Amino acid sequence: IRGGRSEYGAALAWEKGSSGLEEKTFSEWLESVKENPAVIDFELAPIVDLVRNIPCAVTKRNNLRKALQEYAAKFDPCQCAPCPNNGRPTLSGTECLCVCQSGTYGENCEKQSPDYKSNAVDGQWGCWSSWSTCDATYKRSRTRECN
Amino acid sequence: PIDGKWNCWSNWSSCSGRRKTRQRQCNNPPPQNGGSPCSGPASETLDC
Amino acid sequence: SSPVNCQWDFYAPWSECNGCTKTQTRRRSVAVYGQYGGQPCVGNAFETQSCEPTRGCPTEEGCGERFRCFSGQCISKSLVCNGDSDCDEDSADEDRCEDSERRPSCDIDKPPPNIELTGNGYNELTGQFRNRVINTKSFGGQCRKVFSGDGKDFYRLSGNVLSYTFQVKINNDFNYE
Amino acid sequence: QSDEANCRRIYKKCQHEMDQYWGIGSLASGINLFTNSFEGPVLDHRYYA
Amino acid sequence: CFCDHYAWTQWTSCSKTCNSGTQSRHRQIVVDKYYQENFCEQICSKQETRECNWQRCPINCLLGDFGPWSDCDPCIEKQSKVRSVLRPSQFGGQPCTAPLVAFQPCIPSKLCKIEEADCKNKFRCDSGRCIARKLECNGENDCGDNSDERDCGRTKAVCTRKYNPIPSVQLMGNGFHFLAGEPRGEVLDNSFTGGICKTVKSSRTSNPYRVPANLENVGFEVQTA
Amino acid sequence: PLEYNSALYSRIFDDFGTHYFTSGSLGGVYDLLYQFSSEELKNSGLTEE
Amino acid sequence: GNKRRYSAWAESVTNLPQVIKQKLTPLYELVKEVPCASVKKLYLKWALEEYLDEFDPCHCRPCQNGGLATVEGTHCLCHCKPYTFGAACEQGVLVGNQAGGVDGGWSCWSSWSPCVQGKKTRSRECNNPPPSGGGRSCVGETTESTQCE
Amino acid sequence: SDLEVAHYKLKPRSLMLHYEFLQRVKRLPLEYSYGEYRDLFRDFGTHYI
Amino acid sequence: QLLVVENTVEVAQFINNNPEFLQLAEPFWKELSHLPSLYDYSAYRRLIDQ
């Protein structure tokens, strides 16, 4: 369970589920969720847009863009070994952590649920190539191989 | 079962190295289907 | 298995002498660790010698333009008479301070319900939490209210903590064999 | 009361209602380690400074 | 049959140290009158096999050597030395266990060209945020240092009621670590009102929640996603 | 710092991350798995001579 | 346990929560705001290294039955998996599932090489125990190298 | 049942002693004579927490 | 055999600031102020023990 209030969410989670849903419990917890939501889905904008109205605002902004590009190039999860069972890898500086799909569980998704089926239905991006040298129109380029 | 009990550890042995001993005696560990032997150590030694 | 009695190594050579104490120290390593209940090593792993130091004891640089807490920590003079004890243990920034000069710095002072534990140190070998290392309740003269949707109550965050949030996760693992 | 005796003005710092930590004064007692038993008070845990 | 008359053996050692090996255990069956008559051939499984060491094999982190020290910033007066992860750890391999960046105190060569860009007209909070002057002495701590409210008269525009904050409203203002997929430090102060009182009544029984100035729109319809 | 320094800027992403939400939905997530097994065996013999 | 009791506990945790997940930073990164702070920060780094070297369970010879040794100062305890006991966790019977065999365990590191090329280096053997009986290998690298002081 | 409710630590340094202990210490003889330190331990014990 | 393993989180996370903006506890800072400014490991060991 994610989001809600511990009393009610606890109650729900403790429900083994032999019955399925204890509708009372679930409704109460949903009320809790109204009292304390959790973030589910979102549209990101880059933080650098915010850096505004500060001394040297523009210089810091552009430095920060440069740093963000170096940071992504250094710590993008594309460099992880691939997770099992369609785990999406995520990298927290020093370790890749696998986000398991629903119907996959264990520490890093290695055991599937009985219904998962779908064996070796896979695919995720590789890392960017380094930039090509400047071409005839002095454009550099790079590629990523879905591999 | 009677459990063993240490008697008091000896005086410090005169310095050529330093040592003490415990006879495990004060209550005998073996009598009456004697219980646990005493704790270790029975003998303790040190630099002076 | 057999107990293995612990045996001390020889002493290392002495440390350089501390100019603040005029004492040297040398450590006695453990040659063989006591194992399987083998008797632990007996006596101190250290001994101390007096000396003549070659090096002098470094003095405190005082607070200069900053306010000095009685301990010797320094804080911004803007914090004096906040009505908040911005000196950690001493509250010296709040000595002889008039209640006519004390501003109502914030509505509330209740920290989140166990925030002090975030201040603690940790011993990564033993897995034990250890003693308080960070002051988790320096409010910095801010009134940084957060409303805990869990406790349904307002708490005062410190001025410096990056984030503190109260959304819940619950995980249940249940096994019959 | 010597500290506070004859003060022209006492500046109450701890104006709020505050409890002592429960049993904290027990811990100010020394112990006989060989008996593992508390003895006379050695530390003053009511000093707030 | 009472199949456990023919006891099950102990399992094999797992076929591999990691990445889903298997192990099995046959019975100590013997063919016998008891075995034949009690149907012990028909429905006693002769061996079982199971998964073992399923978790993927550990990958240890590797770190490159540090680069050069950076050219010292005049105002930090520390220079940075940094190294790269050659591969992350994962699947329980040893962490990198060491700092990815080190700092050293320099003596700087240049002077700081940074100076305070003190705002023309907004009230300068003692934090140094410049805020809309009308907020000064508005009656709400907007600087958070109460510098706006420090020496003030009439609380010109405090709202008619202490409307409650929106639920979890500060989660909306945390920064998000895209590469990590985890929330991070508070980026937007979704507590900042700016003196407007505009509020949304989630439900007729609930009191209105005060909308912070950083939020343009809010909705409270329940959807079973 | 005003001058570029990759480390000190990178600390920004460490502390605050790279992005912020411009739109979102907040909610609750319920995930449940239940698994049951039963195996049952009966035998009864008679032999008479 | 009762639904009520679990519920009420899960409520009370909101008011007396403990730390349950943490990401650590080394303590020397806090050495600050004192005389010789920059020097003390290095000596605390080195002292943390020394302390790990003192308390690394590598000094403990293996426990049986997946017992995990720990250095209680000068005395290695074996902490025993459920219903296993005795000085080596030799007595009793393990419960649940096991992989079997003897998972290998690292030997204590060599003393670092004397900054050869200005790089320290050291090695560890995985000898203590040898991975045996199909037990799992020791997890981690065999050797280290690092820049000198 | 082992129940744990609070963690206490004394400060490492500059402790404010209790009056009674202070005075009893003040009365200790400067020459060694076991009887007085014995009485001290019997009053206050040997160790503090 | 039963195994139950259960977690509640109620503070989703705390994120402490970087060391440049952390405030040290006065006792810890006072201990650092007495550290011997040399590799007297006994002293730093006592600090790590605390």
From Swiss-Prot, chain C:
Ranges of compositional bias, category Basic and acidic residues: 99-110
Entry superkingdom: Eukaryota
Record localization: Secreted; Target cell membrane
Domain LDL-receptor class A stretches: 61-99
Bias type Acidic residues, positions: 86-98
Sugar attachment sites: 14
Record PTM text: C-, N- and O-glycosylated. O-glycosylated with core 1 or possibly core 8 glycans.
Disulfide bond sites: 6-41, 17-51, 20-57, 63-74, 69-87, 81-97, 106-143
Region (Disordered): 86-121
Domain TSP type-1: 5-58
Disease per UniProt entry: Complement component 7 deficiency: A rare defect of the complement classical pathway associated with susceptibility to severe recurrent infections, predominantly by Neisseria gonorrhoeae or Neisseria meningitidis.
Family: Belongs to the complement C6/C7/C8/C9 family.
Self-association and partners: Monomer or dimer; as a C5b-7 complex it can also form multimeric rosettes. Component of the membrane attack complex (MAC), composed of complement C5b, C6, C7, C8A, C8B, C8G and multiple copies of the pore-forming subunit C9.
Record protein name field: Complement component C7
Organism: Homo sapiens (Human)
Full-sequence portion shown in this chain: 23 to 199 of 843
Swiss-Prot record, chain F:
Entry PTM: All cysteine residues are assumed to be cross-linked to one another. Individual modules containing an even number of conserved cysteine residues are supposed to have disulfide linkages only within the same module.
Protein's cellular compartments: Secreted; Target cell membrane
Glycosylation sites noted in the Swiss-Prot or TrEMBL record: 47
Domain of life the protein comes from: Eukaryota
Disease field: Complement component 6 deficiency: A rare defect of the complement classical pathway associated with susceptibility to severe recurrent infections, predominantly by Neisseria gonorrhoeae or Neisseria meningitidis.
Functional summary from the UniProt entry: Component of the membrane attack complex (MAC), a multiprotein complex activated by the complement cascade, which inserts into a target cell membrane and forms a pore, leading to target cell membrane rupture and cell lysis. The MAC is initiated by proteolytic cleavage of C5 into complement C5b in response to the classical, alternative, lectin and GZMK complement pathways. The complement pathways consist in a cascade of proteins that leads to phagocytosis and breakdown of pathogens and signaling that strengthens the adaptive immune system.
Family: Belongs to the complement C6/C7/C8/C9 family.
UniProt subunit comment: Component of the membrane attack complex (MAC), composed of complement C5b, C6, C7, C8A, C8B, C8G and multiple copies of the pore-forming subunit C9.
Protein name: Complement component C6
Included stretch of the parent chain: 346 to 394 of 934
Curated annotation (Swiss-Prot), chain G:
Intrachain disulfide bonds: 58-108, 60-76, 63-78, 80-89, 115-148, 126-138
Modification note: C-, N- and O-glycosylated. O-glycosylated with core 1 or possibly core 8 glycans.
Positions annotated as glycosylated: 106, 109, 112
Domain TSP type-1: 103-149
Region (Disordered) location: 119-141
Source organism, top-level taxon: Eukaryota
Protein's cellular compartments: Secreted; Target cell membrane
Disease involvement: Complement component 7 deficiency: A rare defect of the complement classical pathway associated with susceptibility to severe recurrent infections, predominantly by Neisseria gonorrhoeae or Neisseria meningitidis.
Family membership: Belongs to the complement C6/C7/C8/C9 family.
Subunit structure: Monomer or dimer; as a C5b-7 complex it can also form multimeric rosettes. Component of the membrane attack complex (MAC), composed of complement C5b, C6, C7, C8A, C8B, C8G and multiple copies of the pore-forming subunit C9.
Protein name listed in UniProt: Complement component C7
Naturally occurring in which organism (per UniProt): Homo sapiens (Human)
Range within the parent protein: 398 to 546 of 843
From Swiss-Prot, chain H:
UniProt PTM comment: N-glycosylated; contains one or two bound glycans. Not O-glycosylated.
Coiled coil: none
Localization per Swiss-Prot or TrEMBL: Secreted; Target cell membrane
Subunit structure: Heterotrimer of 3 chains: alpha (C8A), beta (C8B) and gamma (C8G); the alpha and gamma chains are disulfide bonded. Component of the membrane attack complex (MAC), composed of complement C5b, C6, C7, C8A, C8B, C8G and multiple copies of the pore-forming subunit C9.
Disease with which this protein is associated in UniProt: Complement component 8 deficiency, 2: A rare defect of the complement classical pathway associated with susceptibility to severe recurrent infections, predominantly by Neisseria gonorrhoeae or Neisseria meningitidis.
UniProt function note: Component of the membrane attack complex (MAC), a multiprotein complex activated by the complement cascade, which inserts into a target cell membrane and forms a pore, leading to target cell membrane rupture and cell lysis. The MAC is initiated by proteolytic cleavage of C5 into complement C5b in response to the classical, alternative, lectin and GZMK complement pathways. The complement pathways consist in a cascade of proteins that leads to phagocytosis and breakdown of pathogens and signaling that strengthens the adaptive immune system.
Family: Belongs to the complement C6/C7/C8/C9 family.
Protein name: Complement component C8 beta chain
Full-sequence portion shown in this chain: 297 to 345 of 591
